[model samples]
Target chain A: SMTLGYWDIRGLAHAIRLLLEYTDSSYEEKKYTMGDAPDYDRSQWLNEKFKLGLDFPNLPYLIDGAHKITQSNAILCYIARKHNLCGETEEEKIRVDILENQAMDVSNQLARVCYSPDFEKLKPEYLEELPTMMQHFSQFLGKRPWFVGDKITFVDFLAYDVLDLHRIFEPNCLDAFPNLKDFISRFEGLEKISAYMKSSRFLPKPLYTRVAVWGNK
Target chain B: SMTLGYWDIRGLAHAIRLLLEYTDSSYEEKKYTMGDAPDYDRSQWLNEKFKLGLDFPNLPYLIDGAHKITQSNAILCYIARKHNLCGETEEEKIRVDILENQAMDVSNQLARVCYSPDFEKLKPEYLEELPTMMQHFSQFLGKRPWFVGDKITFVDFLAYDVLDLHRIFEPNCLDAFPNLKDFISRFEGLEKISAYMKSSRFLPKPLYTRVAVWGNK
Candidate 1:
């Protein structure tokens, strides 16, 4: 089985974990939990980070046999390639590639707010511009079943994770975009995804580590 | 013909521009110049941003025929696909994917320092950590002629651009890594790239916009 290593939080691994389940890939987790309270001791991950033989040692890595992968998006594409979910046609591939990074832009923006020491100050501006952000995704998705097109792609997993994070943060963030709401429903309704969510292995909390001012617990 | 759009700076387009030339692809550019200080008026780009039929519009976009793609890496991949620069094997693809995002991480980190209001304050810490950062990349490259084994993949472009940026940031950044220096030499010495650099059309100045505290001419 493949070994996926990350902190025991939903952080960058959210979409990766979701994709692993969706593909029914045989993988085991080596979740490392950060210490609580005054000091967020990361020794658990730091100790093994260099020893793992990973070229660019980082959290949420996948050690699949001889292939050791780092970078969350890279790991997603690695898994996506196994199932031919990278996108088939030229246009689909272009859309897939675009959304892969575009969704990341949204993810990073939200993270900046969530992980900021100035979260209180930054939160208002972020929430104020949240509608503009959602509208872009909404416009990009339009009437498509997925971010790319009719068929599901790895980027949808990325889109799902980032969009859901916003939904959780603001509650009604996706209300104006019925298409995004439907997109979430369609994703969750997937047979493998649905089953995984019900299973004991699913982890859906503590979106960030204790270093963050918000979403630590 | 392809139309590449971005500010009149080397910034993110460094690699994209280099790759286009290396591939001998026919393309034109729509370079937007940001206005002077105080406002740093982005009306040059803002005026036509939404007018383009881009799904998620942003700078360094590539409009090739009907496909209008944003995000620099995505545009690189789009061009790379035409010439099979993405990678041939699963291993190669994995490296390409990993380096694609990893290179961006370094690029963004550098950009953060250069663009920050606290640039002077942050420069020392950044320079202090620079060796560790370069070491990760050096080890990742190892003895390979390119980032991924013998082949010159799209990510070679990404890696080259990021490493070169560091080289400029601190001239001795890559002095400890002979292989990295060689990689830079190899990339810059490419026939097409060499010619492009010598051409009057080359825009290597103002590594960033005027808003940036550094690299902004």
Candidate 2:
């Protein structure tokens, strides 16, 4: 079992949690506040959790049994590898990495919009950018039901997680790209995730809305 | 061999280039102008490149023999894994990825200082933030000579590249962190990199200075 510590927001940690649940791994989630001082105070927590064997610089860190791992993408990839959630072959792994990177780019851009005040003025440009990116994702999904191979893998989890987070703040953001939207819906329909969503462990309100809004149009 | 088309500066391409060099992988570099029109014109170049199956949405992209890979960090990871520069063990690989992500955070912060007009006003805050981050890095580096494992890895290359880039923009930046400064100096003195530095193909000036300047203090 592992303990994952991150902010209450579903920003980066959601993907890792999704990957773990998809793999049927057991883990605990610890939430933290999102201020500079609180983030700085993380060193004390790290000292307590990691003791003398601290291998990570920061969180959202994962405590895997006795080993501590950090970096959201790294944790996802590690879990994927550990649980055979990565695709079957070398080429499949490469494609999975590619899609994961693409999804991360979109997620980072979405975060910038949510966190930056000037994003409203930049919305028109971002609006223009979104359709093109969405179309790219749609075209990829249109070609295959899953991101890497015939079966779902960790990358699908990443793609689904990013789209889910984005849609929470910006409803219908992926509506224009039907296949991509369908792919996200397909992921949510997974029995484990669906059950988790209905449970009290999941936040009552959408986590994305707690940050800021964009793409309402 | 892949043709990496980017600005004359190493802005996003430095880590990719370092990956190639570390792996002894072959590639070509195509420099571009940095004006507004030139920036927009990159899309045209990208379209042409993608038509050849390059499929990049941005610069610092690799036209890999026939396939196209974009996103700087993604390219680094891809190349690192391909060339056996990633790591030997699963834990080592995860650590490498985490270090690389931290390097990315540092690089992004540097970009904010370089590209944004409000950097002067933000300097005080950034200055306050720097020591904490530096100490974190220092403690990590203290345990190992290299970033990930017993041997040098791609993460070390990224760490040094970022610190060097920062020093170029702020000459006295490394003065407070003697160990980090020494580490950078030692990394630069690596035989292959030192030779590459002497070669005429490499740019004589630090890449950041060729673009816009900020944080003159």
Candidate 3:
């Protein structure tokens, strides 16, 4: 059995969860939380849960049977390959790689804007920059329903998860890009994912606060 | 025929180039100069050579026969698969993924130190931080010659390139990590790779400038 240990947020771990659910893979999702401060216990969990030869003492580790895999992208790609989440042909696989790379670029750009200390100064530039990225993706998706070929691949799942996470953090994030809006909506309409979103496993809290006033300003 | 378009120096494109060389793949290398004045003419060769649909508007783009592929890691993985640079077994492939991910993490950290605008404050922290990362890697590589299994996989190429790039930028970079240093040395000692390095095509010219320096303050 595969066990995914992660925090209670839709982050890097969310894609893996979606991929598992999408493929109907049997797995366990383990959520962790940092308890109240002052008397917080970091060492106990750090030593007990993660002291072994885990790559980069980080969250969101996938323990496949006994093999512990860290790194979100690695885990996603591994699971995707294991579950045949790549499309039928070689061309489709190549396109899936292309789309996955594009999605990762978009996710990184969003992270920069959200996590940077100078978010105020950077937000406007990112807002202007993100539309261009969104538009490019929109143009690509406008040509096809899924990110890659006709059928959905792991890239679509990854892209959908990233878009969903961003939307939760930045509402109306995909409003300007209609094609992307449609692309995401199609993914959201998937029964398995929709059910997962409504389940107790879903993290109801937003990862980042939306700067609604910043948009107005 | 494959064509790689990137700056003269092997920054991000080094690993891909090394992988191609390791596999004895036929390819052409095009080096560009980022001119003092920010004009499109400097990269006009790339734009003209690889037209819009086929060409990526960035360095490290790989042209495979007629199809063009961008993104360094994606290109590396593709070339690895095409050239049988991946491990023999599926388990080994997953191990390759882990090693590649670790190498990428190291590269990212090195980039933060090298490219960050506030290098004065960041460089020292990076210098302090890098040893720990290298130590972790060195420990992982304990008795094994290669990163994955017994044989050299794409991850070895990536690890070697990442370490070499760091060594190029930061003098005595791998001295502390004995295992990594030996691993790189052993990788370089491979017959085909050694021959390729000796060839005229392997000439090195510094592209990225050392804009900032760390002092023993």
Candidate 4:
């Protein structure tokens, strides 16, 4: 059996969990709950962080027998390689590689605004720039079923997570991009994905940690 | 011939340039220079940003024939795949993937401080946290000849560029870690890299764009 350790909240583990479930891998969750408010004491994670034998210790780690991996994207690649979901062909590989970083950049940009103390002040600026960012994504996505052509690569999972976050942040964000909306619909309709979402194991609330000004709950 | 497009500064393209030179790829650069101060007009890049056929349309893009790629790590992977420099074994591949994201996080941390308006106030906090970050790298590197084992991978180029940037930022930073010093020396000793450094093509100055509070000039 494999073990996935992360905060009890959704945070970075949402996509990882989706991939794990979609693959039907035998894995268990090790959710660490953070103390609320000011302190946000991370003792739950800190106590075992150093003992986990991770080279670069951080949250959202996956341990399968001998392989103890950290970093959410690395963990995604680890699983994707096993399932051959990393994409094939030079074009596909390049697209996978590009989206892997681009999605992170977009997600981090949102996280930056959400986690800031000046969220109120920055909210308008972020909203002002939202359409342009969404346009780039919509243009990149185009008519493709997934981010990288017809195949559903691991990056589709990543792209799904980030775009869904934006949609959540601004409920109507993807309304203008019909392609993006259809893409999301196509993704949620996957047999495994549909099943996983209905399962009791799915954890989707509190998109960010309590320290954040938004999505903390 | 491949064409790499970026600002005239070192910024994100440093590692990509090193990988190109080391692989002896016949590539030409199209440097876009930003205007000085105040407005810091980006008309130079804005002029042809979308016309380049880049999917995500970003700086530090690589165009090889019909394949147009954006994102710095993606560009590194593009070139690395051509040279078979991507890790071979599953373990090696895992390490490669881990360092790929980890190094970027570390580099971005430094960039955040340097590019911040509160750089003077933020410097001390970054400095305070630098040792733990360096320790993670040192422990990860350990006795290996290169990161991700004996064979030098694309991530070594990424690591070299980020670590070298830190060294330039704080001259005495690597003094505490002999392995890092040796690693720097070892990377610079590569024949093609050495030749490239000596050649006029090497652009080491202005480690960041003019907007940055430090390393702008």
State each candidate's clash count.
0, 0, 0, 0
lDDT string, candidate 3, A26-117, tens digits: 89977765554445444434654546467555667888866788777778878888767776776776677667666776776676566666
TM-scores, all candidates, are 0.97, 0.87, 0.86, 0.97
lDDT value, candidate 1, whole model: 0.88
Candidate 4: tens digits of C-alpha lDDT, residues B113-172: 898899999899989888878888889899898988989999999989989888988877
TM-score of 3: 0.86
In candidate 4, stretches whose alpha carbon ends up further than 4 angstroms from where it belongs are: none
Top candidate on TM-score is 4
lDDT by residue for model 1 (B142-193), tens? 9999999898988998898888777778999889989899988998888888
Q: Model 2, range A1-217, lDDT digits (tens) per residue? A: 7888876666677778778876788988877654333233434455555453555545678878876777788788788888777757766756776788778878888777766777778776777677677776776666677877588888887888777765755576687877787677777788998998787776423354244554321
Q: What tens digits encode model 4's per-residue C-alpha lDDT throughout A55-84?
A: 998998989889988899999999999999
* Residue pairs in clash, model 3: none
Model 4 chain B scores worst on lDDT over the 10 consecutive residues at B49-58
Candidate 1 off by > 4 Å: none
Q: Residue B39 CA error for candidate 3 (Å)?
A: 9.5
* Native contacts kept, each candidate: 0.97, 0.49, 0.40, 0.89
Q: Write the per-residue lDDT of candidate 3 for residues B92-114, one digit (tens) a residue.
A: 86777777877886776666565
TM-score of 2: 0.87
Candidate 2: which docking quality band?
Answer: medium
Evaluated against the true structure, the overall lDDT of model 2 is 0.70
Where is model 1 chain A poorest over a 10-residue stretch in terms of lDDT?
Answer: A33-42
